[PDB]
Structure formats: C-alpha cells, structure tokens
Symmetry: C2
Subunit: 290 residues, 2 copies
Amino acid sequence: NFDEAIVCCQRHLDISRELNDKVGEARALYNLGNVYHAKGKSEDVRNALQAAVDLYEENLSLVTALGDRAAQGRAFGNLGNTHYLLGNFRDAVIAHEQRLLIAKEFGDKAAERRAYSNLGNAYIFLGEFETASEYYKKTLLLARQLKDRAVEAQSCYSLGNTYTLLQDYEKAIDYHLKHLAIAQELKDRIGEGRACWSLGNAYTALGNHDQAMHFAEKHLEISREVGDLEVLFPPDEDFFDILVKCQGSRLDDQRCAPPSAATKGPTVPDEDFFSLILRSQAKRMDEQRV
Amino acid sequence: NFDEAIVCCQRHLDISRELNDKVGEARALYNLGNVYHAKGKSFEDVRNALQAAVDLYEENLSLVTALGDRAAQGRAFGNLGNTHYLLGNFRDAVIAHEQRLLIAKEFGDKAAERRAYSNLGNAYIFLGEFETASEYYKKTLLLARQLKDRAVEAQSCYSLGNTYTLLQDYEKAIDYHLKHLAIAQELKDRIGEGRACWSLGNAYTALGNHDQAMHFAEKHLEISREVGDLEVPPDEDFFDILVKCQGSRLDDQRCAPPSAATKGPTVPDEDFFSLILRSQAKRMDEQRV
C-alpha cells in the first residue's frame, strides 16, 4: 500500500506548508519518513531508505525548533534504525546515542534498554565486540530490573554470540545456558532450537565432542518439527535452519518453514549473528590451512 | 539472507537427485519454495520469485503425492494457495485451499480447518463474490468459538463486518463489528479498537446516523493519535493514513515506524478498508449525474 500512502502524506505536507503549519509539516515529514522506511525493508531500496533518512533529518531539525524532546527522540531512534539498515553503523551509533540520553532524561527504562540493545548490534557489525559486550551487559541488567524474562534471554543470547566472536567459548556457553533456561521456562521452542545449535557449536570449538554431539541432536529434533509447521504466533527471515546445515554434503537436515510459520520466538534477539560466526570461523579454518 | 539460503537448498536438491533420494528431493523443493515465497514478499520481478515458488511447490506436490503423504500434500496445497493469492490467481488460490480444507477435515484439524475457511473467504472477497465469502467467514466464526479462540473470533467478526459493508448491509455490518469491538476491549487490543471505531463510524455514516458516526470517529481519532507516537505481525496497510485522505482535512494522518507497526491479535489477516473506501468512492461519482 506504499503508494497510496505516500501521496496522502505528500498532500498533508503540501497543505501544511501552504498553511504555515509548523507542527503538521513535522508530522507529515515523520509519516512520510515512516512509509519510506517501511518500503525500504519490503538496491533501489537504498533510494527508499536514503529518502527516509533525509525525511527524518528534516523533521528532526523542525521538532527541535519546536523543542519537543520526545519527538526529537522518535526521529533519532528512527534515524538509528534506518542508518543501521543502510550500513552506516557510524551514523547509527551517533543517533541511538542521543536516543539513549533522551530515554534517560525521561527515565524511560524500556527505551533505555532498547537503545543499549540497538547500540550493541551496531558495534557488532563494526567488529568492535569488546565495546559491544559492554552494552549487552547494560541491556541485561536493565531487563532484570524491568522484570522482563523475554528480553533477559535475548541479551543472554546476544552476549553468547558476542563472546563466541571473541573466541571466549567458556563465557559464551555460560550466557547461552542462561538463555536456554528462560527459553524452556517460557516454553519458547524456536528459541530452544537456537540455543542448542549455538551451544553445540561453541563446544565444538572447545573440543567437547561429547557435549557438542548432545546439543546438535536437541537442535536437530526441534529443527525437524518446525519445518512441518504451517502457522506461528516477528518475521524471521534469516533462514537459520538452512544456513546452519550447509556444511559439506551432509545436508539432509536442512529445514525451512513457509512465511506464515516463519516467526521468531520472544527470546531470540532482533539480531542473531550465527552467519557471522559461521563465516568467521570459516575464514579461520582456511587461514590455518597453511 | 535469501541468496545464501537458495544455494544451500540447491546443493541439497542437487545431491538428493544424484543419490536418487525421493524424500530429500521433495524436502529440498519445499525448502526452496519457502525461500522464494518469502523473497516474493520482501524483494514486479517479484512475480519471478513468486511464480518460482509456485513452480517449486507444484513439483514437490506431485512428488509427495507419489510418496503418498497426505499431511505433506497438505503443506504444499496450503502454500500454493498462499502464493497464488499473492499473485492474484484467486481462481487457483481457491482450488488449492479447498484441498487444504479437505485435508484438515481428514485429520480432524480444527485450527487448520478454520485458517482455510478464513483463507477462502479472503480469496472470494477479491473475486467480488461477497455472498459466497460471508458463507466461509461464518464457518470460520463458528469454528473459532468451538476452538475457544477469542482472538480469531474477533477477526471473523471484523471480516464479516467488512464483508456486509461491501454488500451495503450496514445493519448487519455494525452488528458484527460491535461483537468484534467487544472482544477487542475484552482482550485489550488497542490497535484493534482503533480499527473497529473507524469501521463503525464509517458504516453509520452510510446509514445517516451522524450522531453515532461522529462518536466513533472520535474514539478512533484518540487511539490513532497515540499509536503514532509509539516506537515499539507486520502491519503494512498504512491504515491511519489511508483512512484520513479525504479532502483537505488531513491533520489527523498517523503512521508508526516499522518497529511499532504491528497489527493486533483481533485484526484479520486482511482488512478491506481500502476496497470499501474505493468502492463507495466509485458510487459517489456514479450518483454525480
């Protein structure tokens, strides 16, 4: 519906400019940035996304002239997310950083946490894993204070992936187990299949074939059943149960559900860096080769 | 991630063909059809992704049929219905979902039965066959109650609401949307509430009840206002914009960022507000002389 929508906001903005309506112009700019933003995630896509950024940044300066701190916040947060989708992790960070500060001013714990969590993701893409674990830990402490079991599990998972990248599999396992617990606790099956792969992949890197073998099987069982699924209660498009079983010619256990049933559990983080991890130890295997 | 994924399934399929592995070939075909399917709704060369998925699912189907797995045939049929639906082949959609319903009936699968009735209703709505569509929505409504599913229940009511509105029976339309508005409030689905309110206030308008119309429009307006300021099921129908696109009274357009752009549990898969909008738009111009 992205085209009917865009014309409408254009109409709205058109009018607001004619009427010298500073508020409504800013709103139309936000609305129009939101549509583009959503078009951008559904490489002339870069055109939709750069528009959204342009639009949000215009709105920002305006809502700043007005002086609405919450409304500046909404733009900053959107800017973080758009830049993030574009690769401008540099700019992502700058924008989310403000967003965290504005959540701090309002004492917004949920928005504080989301921002730490967002910042973490950006730092991971920058390869700055040390500075990223710093934020994930922050987001973890907040989740507990927020009494949010779900997010809690996500920060654990996210910290898991982090340390795995640092090649500290001892702390990685610690975190994923904490997450595997909340998964079971909250009965998030899809999240369970995720931990199990992760764990079984960490242990592998430790030489614990015994424990690795175990988890791979737990993952295999859950994998098997979510393939036969046709519906599920968050659009998981990372093709996890296929990518993760793409090694050599032992491929019989690739699984993938239809888009309807392709949802991520409440304990899976926004970003799961399995493929990075995968590609990253792939690089090192070849580096040892001589 | 759609490209790494496709080559993997391709590898898998390649191998399964080499090994004369009939099961694994069918599985690779399903996996490959699922990736395309998902590419099709996220990346009009899209028609290429979607027609592939169909081709892929149809191959798999004949194969799983050779094997004789009724549940696995079922998964393909259901996918086929959904892919055709996305393509416009509402004809083909129906044929495929029909089987799916029958297969859910064989297994006594009430949840799958219901989803299929509901899917069939959507297809018939796009065919302009609104009479035959209310027939299915009513089926899906009875099942929801039997399933004890308050959420779906509200969705069938909402869906029936839109249906009758198209039939220009605003009296029954209102009845259904009110039933839905109740469950919405009951289950505290705010976003769903703003939907009912618009719908109702739009129906009443068509009845001449300015009094009640004016009411709901205000309830909708209040919810609308607050979900725009929000920051955290991908609702991409731009409802709170499209619905306020009449004349130059546009100050109340609202739209949330993608993160916060989720649909409530009582909003149906398909909300036909735009059809309704465009449909009474056609008639306004038709009366003009």
